[PDB]
Subunit: 245 residues, 4 copies
């Protein structure tokens, strides 16, 4: 309907991945603000569309939403020759800006959010690029300090100590100018609650602006959507939630 | 994920419409079937675009079929598009060919719709006698006491395209009351409307008339307007009335 | 692969149609030329992608291709309240300009093409908008003066009345290309092909004759051929070689 | 139109890959024959739909066409934990059989074809499963004994290691079609075409020679052509004429 976002289901060639690849875009209704919205493990670019009311949530909101695909590659340039980090941090923004010149190129209007694996990817991209002003993690896999062996090796190689490896958010934080607002939620009955506690505590000590919340909840889409609703209210976009009598 | 429905987006040729046409189907991980009908301005993508129906169906043994009537009111129109025949007769035949494991039993065959889709839902239930349960969410269930111009909906030519010239709605062949003559009364009818919906009085009237005709109608109403948030909530309630062992997601 | 166009399946709201609606876009891999490519009766915005190799054809070509949907409404503001002409001639270009500012807004680089019902729609939009430099019809339904849908039992009386109302005489009705031509500045290069074994061949001969009499720039070609996708695909290939876009046909040894 | 195949674009969960995954199906519009149609490198389940007139080709043909996705994984259970072979050889057919009970479960009505990487994957599935009666390769990557991907700027050392591990000699490796052929009952008709100007021409010549030596029924053709979709579409047409489906043109 009127005020609902247009939806762009995009098939594009990734030179970085040497693959025909996919992204979804929600386009409002120029310097239009952008939110990158990252899926978790087992997911892809369709996840937020399949698993939440993000479309309804974006009604009347001047915000472009970009949903990338990392296909179980952890937003990482992998050991097996698939450069997912490069494809999504570098190539995708270039591809989209070419299609959509009215999308903002300003940090203060560029945001990121993800759930689980996407929570890790979100914080990683926020810390390494310095191109985002706000970054949100919902039940993120924020630390491995506390699949299959071949699978995990494919992502991270051999890991002795997670926190001191270049893959930890603590280590990636060294690349950050610390000017990104970080936002995190985790359910208190989530298996990743303690990983979130450790990562948040570390990032705060390292001097980062981290707004961490936690409440009753488990590792489920209902909660991640609810927390996206909360995160959107923190953005400079004048968001309004639907009436719910 | 595991237990989530498969989604198939189907491009098929409608011989009835003489059109390339489309439908969406959710297929679970003699399987019951729910036909889920869109409203005005909508199409076969509406329920997927506007609700968490996909997430709602996790772990539930139910095929969901989403047809498209493209603003044609689930009606064989005045302008040569036989949408009723295409969706009531052709689509079920097409899908049965693809999906032989879909039930052919009335007791396992259901339909639901919102607004124009609530009208279409009750029309199909009353005319076919092939459904056991039929639900309307803020349905356009009568035009006797509701005029679309009060809400700047369509135009005189558009309405004439669907229904022709209508002197009196209820006594016309298009009313649910008139269409009810084709019904064996053995379909459970289920309706909700928000008390702040422009269609509240239309629902009140149609429900009273169908009950007076001896239909089994379960009508509920509460705070609410003409919005997707409510239709999604009421689909959730309706699913609990079906013989499908549905359980809602955890919400702490 | 590399050099292949990106494909955009677009779900947008049409205020004109009061509908959730759709279009497909091929976007080359900056004032980029655009071709609007119109489907025929029984088709939709998916037709050219489903029924031809247009995607493979556009490899390495700097041209955006827009495939709209008129859903059997003849690119016409109908008698039953669906304003397909306004939706496609007016609203769609505005919607696309907003999404794609790098798409050209110049007549010199804006083109249109269509098969059958889409050939009619193509010439109609070319004549009435003055926004296109080149317009191509493939086996177009260019006249109903000497063609009747009753010859092949296409549609139904109610269907045709739904599109055009009651017509005494096609050529003198406001729906004819001959009537619609009055809105044209005559600056569009019109291009038409029709197969000699097509039910629409004489309709093409007549429309072409009439438009040339009115002083239009019309290039008309015909050869053995029938009312089939094989021919429409072949003629699209020919049309692309005529456009100011550096098109090169794939190798076929 | 009338007689054209229905198209279903399918999103399903792959337990084997722990992925939301995809396949396309053309369904003719009862024991219906099935063709698995495999994409090449850089492609996916959409490849044959995007790059050919396969839809038009199948008008009036009683054949289901299944297009899987191996996402640059070479139809192989990889060294990095993605079991593409198992997902496509075992899981996908079980998934589709559940949706479509009218699809054949007979070997004599089950066929497979692929281009490039898909030619390799096709012959691999045919040799290993013994569940197909006819298998076709179009410009297939049928051997790496005499072809190095580096010559065409394809992949990277890390990429190839991810698929095949370290390879001292291709033909004697368990990954070669020659080695995979040990699992075959030889009761699958193999069909191959390659362009005489294709960079994979010599790889085809070698694999065909070897499979013939091993006692396989291999129909191999070659003519003018390069590594392009135009040729693969034409050759799919020729392959269809060899199938027990009364294909028309
Ligand atoms: Ca959705
Ligand atoms: Ca295609």
């Amino acid at each position: 309907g009127a005020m609902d976002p247009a939806v762009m289901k995009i098939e594009y060639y990734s030179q970085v991945l040497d693959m025909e690849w996919g992204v979804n875009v929600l386009y409002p209704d120029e310097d239009i603000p952008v939110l990158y919205l990252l899926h978790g493990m087992s997911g892809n670019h369709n996840s937020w569309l399949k698993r939440t009311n993000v479309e309804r949530l974006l009604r009347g909101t001047n915000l472009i939403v970009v949903m990338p695909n990392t296909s179980n590659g952890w937003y990482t340039d992998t050991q097996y020759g698939f450069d997912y980090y490069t494809a999504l941090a570098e190539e995708l923004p270039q591809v989209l800006k070419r299609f959509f010149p009215n999308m903002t190129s300003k940090r203060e209007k560029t945001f990121i959010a993800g759930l689980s694996m996407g929570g890790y990817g979100c914080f990683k991209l926020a810390l390494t690029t310095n191109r985002f002003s706000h970054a949100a993690s919902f039940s993120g896999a924020l630390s491995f300090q506390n699949g299959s062996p071949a699978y995990w090796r494919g992502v991270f190689g051999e890991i002795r100590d997670w926190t001191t490896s270049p893959y930890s958010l603590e280590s990636l934080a060294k690349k950050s100018d610390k000017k990104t607002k970080l936002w995190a939620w985790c359910g208190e009955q989530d298996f990743l609650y303690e990983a979130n506690n450790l990562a948040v505590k570390n990032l705060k000590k390292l001097g980062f602006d981290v707004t961490y919340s936690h409440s009753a909840g488990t590792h489920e889409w209902y909660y991640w959507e609810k927390q996206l609703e909360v995160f959107l209210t923190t953005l400079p976009i004048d968001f309004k939630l639907e009436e719910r009598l």
